């Protein structure tokens, strides 16, 4: 019955108009391909059901969505497509909520269908004009984000039509100025890697209407000869410049003939993408410089600063090219020089783009000013501009002395008495400056932490993590403590403290809280994956440690690729993580040979190895000393035990101490 009914409904839709009850009395009884045929019949006569959302209530559309079938799921999506014109907005986003998780599926056909759904919504139902309730705004945000992710379809035609859909004056207004304004408001928190590339793509494809862009820029060749397309062998690249070639150099090439290769390289090369984006944006600024009203100009700069916030706030990788582009764009423009010093500081620090923001903040100072000063000081400490830092904390905003005596300690690198000064007077708020800035307060907290991390005082590292800080938060910290920004700064120190204490538990609490919320885990693996590897290699769940170490190798490679190498200190610090990564990876790989794992031949010959390969601190920062010390001690304690002896281990402890001394 139902098989021939699904066979005839396509053959004749009207005949299905007598067995709605039959399928509805059987749809929650039909669960195999019978369910598929029920979907076929429903789709063919969805108009036959004036109200069938209550079927979804009763027939559990959601459970069908759990099923994996481009057939079943896609035809359900098509049914919704038929009935979403008639669907109520509340039911509409109700159905949307389970839909959104299906994006980016290898089906690419039911995926394509639901992307059609999303664009249709953003066109007529989730469209920016139907935004009357938070329902509608949420729907439109979801649709715009998923179609943003659709700009990058592995299907070039699909993403191409998506680009056409967007660039359309409805979705993206036609005028270059207002197109730009919409682009500033259209960034997705995950696309800053290619947000600039796609924005350039849209901007340049607008130039198509320019009835000279497809024309040549030159018509007066200095050397004129025959110009015909040139060929090239491409045995197992597609052309973007035809090479109308000959004896003499032509100059009558089209503007398009250059722009299209230019657009392709821009959308492919991110660094050139951001350079081009900055240049074009500035040129647009000159375009508005003709006669445009400064009221509109400052409104645009305000909304652009807000956009920059929504970029930095919603980014967590902090794309070093994107971050640098935003920084310089702020640099060249006074109304754009109004950045939050804390925001640009954090962006530089997460992007290792410190000096660019240092120049930006320098322009800001020479243009609050105390916050600008303290952020410049924070980055100077991070890099090591301790000389100008001394000048600043003696002249600009630095009126204290514990800050300055600890500055002397840090220049003398004996952080011990620096932290003694700070933890001595860090909880007290009265000072010669009255109230020092809370930035200076958490700077003192971070200096005490940097001491007790520099020293082997991991117990006092956790102690200054918990109590020695100002009593602005409970001692221990977890995901419920990430909201304070200083705690976010402390997090690498937090993992350091707890990992070394275990190497000597709120750590595991925050670890599970880090898997709880993939942003936390992503950031941790981006910046502390090797610490996790050392932990879970010490925690003896070494499979997790190997997982963390491979993820950390990939994160290091990707960060070093993204983070500019010309900032040679940043690149050097990036490559200082090599020792622990290799430690964990190679120890796991070699641990298959467990014969030389507890015997004394990995002890007598390999204990002196504890303290043979030790650098000098000038070329190896002493935090990386703590790193490599943990690495080597882990090596030659794990390889000497758990399948010359004691005096040699004591000698190696002692020699490690002299190397600490040197």
């Amino acid at each position: 019955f139902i098989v021939c009914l699904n066979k005839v409904t396509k053959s004749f839709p009207p005949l299905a108009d007598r067995f709605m009850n039959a399928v509805f009395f059987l749809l929650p009884k039909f669960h195999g391909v019978l369910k598929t045929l029920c979907l076929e019949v429903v789709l063919c006569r969805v108009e036959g059901m004036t109200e069938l959302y209550f079927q979804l209530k009763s027939k559990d559309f959601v459970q069908v969505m759990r099923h994996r079938d481009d057939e079943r799921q896609k035809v359900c999506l098509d049914i919704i497509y038929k009935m979403m014109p008639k669907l109520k907005p509340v039911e509409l986003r109700e159905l949307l909520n389970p839909v959104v998780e299906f994006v980016s599926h290898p089906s690419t056909t039911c995926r394509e269908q639901m992307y059609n759904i999303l664009m249709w919504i953003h066109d007529n139902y989730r469209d920016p004009e139907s935004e009357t309730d938070n329902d509608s705004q949420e729907i439109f945000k979801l649709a715009k984000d998923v179609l943003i992710q659709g700009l990058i379809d592995e299907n070039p035609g699909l993403q191409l039509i998506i680009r056409n859909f967007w660039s359309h004056e409805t979705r993206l207004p036609s005028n270059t100025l207002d197109r730009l304004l919409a682009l500033n408001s259209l960034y997705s928190p995950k696309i800053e890697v290619h947000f600039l590339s796609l924005a350039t793509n849209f901007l340049l494809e607008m130039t198509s209407m320019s009835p000279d862009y497809p024309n040549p820029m030159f018509e007066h060749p200095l050397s004129e000869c025959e110009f015909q397309e040139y060929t090239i062998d491409s045995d197992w690249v597609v052309l973007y410049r035809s090479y109308r070639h000959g004896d003499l150099p032509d100059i009558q090439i089209k503007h398009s003939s250059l722009i299209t290769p230019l657009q392709a390289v821009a959308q492919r090369d991110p660094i050139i993408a951001k350079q081009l984006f900055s240049s074009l944006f500035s040129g647009i600024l000159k375009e508005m410089d003709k006669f445009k009203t400064l009221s509109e100009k400052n409104n645009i700069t305000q909304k652009l600063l807000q956009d920059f916030n929504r970029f930095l706030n919603t980014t967590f990788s902090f794309f070093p090219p994107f971050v640098s582009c935003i920084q310089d764009i702020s640099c060249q423009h006074a109304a754009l020089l109004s950045l939050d010093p804390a925001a640009v500081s954090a962006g530089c620090l997460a992007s290792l783009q410190q000096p660019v923001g240092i120049r930006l903040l320098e322009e800001a100072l020479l243009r609050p000013d105390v916050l600008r000063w303290v952020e410049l000081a924070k980055l100077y400490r991070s890099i090591g501009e301790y000389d100008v830092l001394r000048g600043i904390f003696t002249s600009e905003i630095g009126t204290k002395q514990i800050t300055q005596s600890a500055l002397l300690a840090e220049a003398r690198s004996d952080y011990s008495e620096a932290a003694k000064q700070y933890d001595e007077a860090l909880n007290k708020q009265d000072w010669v400056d009255g109230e020092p800035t809370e930035a200076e307060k958490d700077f003192w907290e971070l200096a005490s932490l940097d001491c007790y991390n520099h020293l082997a005082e991991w117990k006092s590292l956790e102690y200054c993590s918990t109590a020695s800080i100002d009593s602005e938060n409970p001692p221990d910290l977890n995901k419920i403590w990430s909201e304070p920004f200083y705690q976010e700064t402390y997090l690498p120190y937090m993992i350091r403290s707890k990992l070394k204490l275990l190497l000597q538990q709120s750590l595991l609490t925050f670890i599970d809280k880090a898997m709880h919320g993939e942003l936390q885990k992503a950031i941790l693996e981006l910046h502390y994956s090797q610490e996790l590897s050392l932990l879970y290699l010490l925690q003896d769940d070494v499979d997790r440690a190997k997982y963390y170490i491979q993820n950390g190798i990939q994160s290091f490679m990707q960060n070093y690729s993204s983070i500019d190498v010309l900032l040679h200190q940043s690149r050097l610090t990036k490559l200082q993580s090599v020792q622990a990564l290799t430690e964990i990876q190679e120890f796991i790989s070699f641990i298959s040979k467990q014969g030389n794992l507890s015997s004394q031949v990995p002890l007598k010959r390999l204990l002196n190895t504890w303290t043979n390969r030790y650098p000098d601190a000038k070329m190896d920062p002493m935090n990386i000393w703590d790193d490599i010390i943990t690495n080597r001690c882990f090596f030659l304690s794990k390889i000497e035990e758990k399948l010359d002896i004691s005096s040699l281990i004591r000698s190696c402890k002692f020699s490690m101490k002299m190397k600490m001394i040197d």
């Binding site: 009850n21 929650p28 009884k29 009763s58």
Partner: protein
């Protein structure tokens, strides 16, 4: 046969239960039905989902619908849920937490019923819905009538009685005596699986299946499972022929079956042991016809069953059996069959007394058209005592006991009596659910009833004693 009648309790709350108020009597009806169903069939599912409510408690959450115990195998859950509300105080508290009579759309409740019947995943032969109202509670009804008709098309039956056959005027078109439902039906097992039909070797060239289905035969107490004496969970009972002289459990290669006959235990093998059980093949090997006059009928005493054909294995079952029972009228004989339910079975000499269909005005299949198994005895089991037939009838005595007893003329309703153990323990299970006493006693009417009223009908055996000593003690 997979397939039963699925029933739901769709009871209206339009204060047509609150006028005794119909609610309490309706709840007694439903609880008695559930008591029957728990002791009869868990295959049938019971849905305590009432509508007319002040709440929208249902899957799709439609107007004036409440769910208490949805479609499920019967049990004490619904028993206690209705027991907490059966009383008048139970009725008022029910109206408190559930609600009173409210407005709604009948299309909503019928849609919920359709969802309920389409959510169960049992091949179900029939579907039924019950409903109670004091009178006719009523667009609001036209869509309702349409949906009810559609559900009827889906095999769903509708049951309703107006508790004012007087006043259901607005419901006469809507609709498609509960004293029977007051637990008159109780404790009847519903199984439809049984042995494959046996092959009647009626002759030497054609054999015909006979339908012997032990599906509605004797039912008794539920399975006593060896639950844990502490937590009431069963045990696996690891048991087999195990060893003490050698320890452990004996393996099949080490187990031999013998027979202690004559002066020795005649050791055979298990293969010979279980292949000896056969004299020929499975089925009803027919020797011929035996006149019914040659039946001992004082040895036709063992548990006897019926012998019916089965028009499923051979085309000629119904055909030849119809002809045979047509011509059974002129025969005083029985189909003399040897009976093997399966392979390796000792056939039993069986006389097939023609028990043809008693098709009444409604053609009820009482004594279905086939044969009844007549016992042909043997010489090893009867409690025989030495015969003494020097005593014949005497006219005074025969007349006296005739006048004593001939008034009491029964009809022998085969199912009139109640099994003591079966109904006893089933209603005892009911009481266990109720957490109460021994509810009531079942008996095979083993206490005589005429002896208390034979003298009421004019007994003469008591009146006329053949001896000063009790004539027959």
């Amino acid at each position: 046969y997979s397939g039963r009648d699925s029933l739901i309790f769709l009871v209206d709350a339009s204060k047509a239960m609150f006028e005794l108020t119909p609610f309490d009597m309706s709840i007694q009806c439903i609880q008695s039905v559930y008591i029957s169903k728990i002791i009869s069939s868990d295959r049938d599912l019971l849905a305590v989902v009432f509508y007319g409510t002040e709440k929208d408690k249902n899957s799709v959450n439609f107007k004036n619908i409440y769910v208490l115990q949805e479609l499920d195998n019967p049990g004490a859950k619904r028993i206690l849920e209705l027991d907490q509300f059966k009383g008048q105080q139970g009725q008022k508290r029910f109206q408190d937490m559930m609600g009173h009579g409210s407005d709604y759309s009948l299309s909503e409740v019928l849609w919920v019923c359709a969802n309920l019947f389409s959510d169960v995943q049992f091949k179900m032969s029939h579907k039924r819905i019950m409903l109670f109202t004091n009178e006719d509670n009523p667009a609001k009804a036209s869509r309702a009538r349409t949906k009810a008709g559609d559900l009827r098309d889906t095999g769903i039956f509708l049951d309703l009685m107006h508790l004012k056959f007087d006043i259901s005027l607005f419901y006469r078109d809507i609709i498609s005596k509960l004293e029977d439902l007051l637990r008159k039906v109780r404790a009847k097992e519903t199984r439809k699986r049984a042995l494959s039909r046996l092959k009647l070797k009626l002759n030497k060239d054609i054999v015909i299946s006979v339908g012997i289905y032990n599906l509605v035969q004797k039912a008794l107490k539920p399975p006593p499972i060896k639950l844990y004496r502490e937590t009431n969970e069963p045990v696996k009972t690891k048991t087999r022929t195990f060893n003490t002289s050698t320890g452990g459990l004996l393996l099949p290669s080490d187990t031999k079956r013998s027979q202690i006959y004559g002066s020795r235990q005649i050791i055979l093998e298990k293969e010979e042991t279980e292949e000896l059980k056969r004299f020929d093949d499975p089925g009803l090997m027919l020797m011929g016809f035996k006149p019914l006059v040659l039946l001992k009928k004082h040895h036709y005493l063992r548990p006897s069953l019926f012998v019916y054909p089965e028009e499923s294995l051979v085309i000629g079952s119904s055909t030849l059996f119809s002809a045979l029972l047509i011509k059974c009228l002129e025969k005083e004989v029985a189909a003399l069959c040897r009976y093997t339910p399966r392979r390796n079975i000792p056939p039993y000499f069986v006389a097939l007394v023609p028990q043809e269909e008693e098709l009444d005005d409604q053609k009820i299949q009482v004594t279905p058209p086939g044969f009844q198994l007549v016992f042909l005895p043997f010489a090893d089991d009867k409690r025989k005592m030495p015969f003494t037939e020097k005593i014949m009838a005497t006219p005074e005595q025969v007349g006296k006991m005739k006048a004593i007893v001939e008034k009491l003329r029964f009809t022998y309703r085969s199912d009139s009596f109640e099994n003591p153990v079966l109904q006893q323990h089933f209603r005892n299970l009911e009481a266990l659910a109720l957490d109460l006493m021994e509810p009531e006693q079942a008996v095979d009417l083993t206490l005589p009833k005429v002896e208390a009223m034979n003298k009421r009908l004019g007994s003469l055996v008591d009146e006329f004693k053949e001896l000063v000593y009790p004539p027959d003690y």
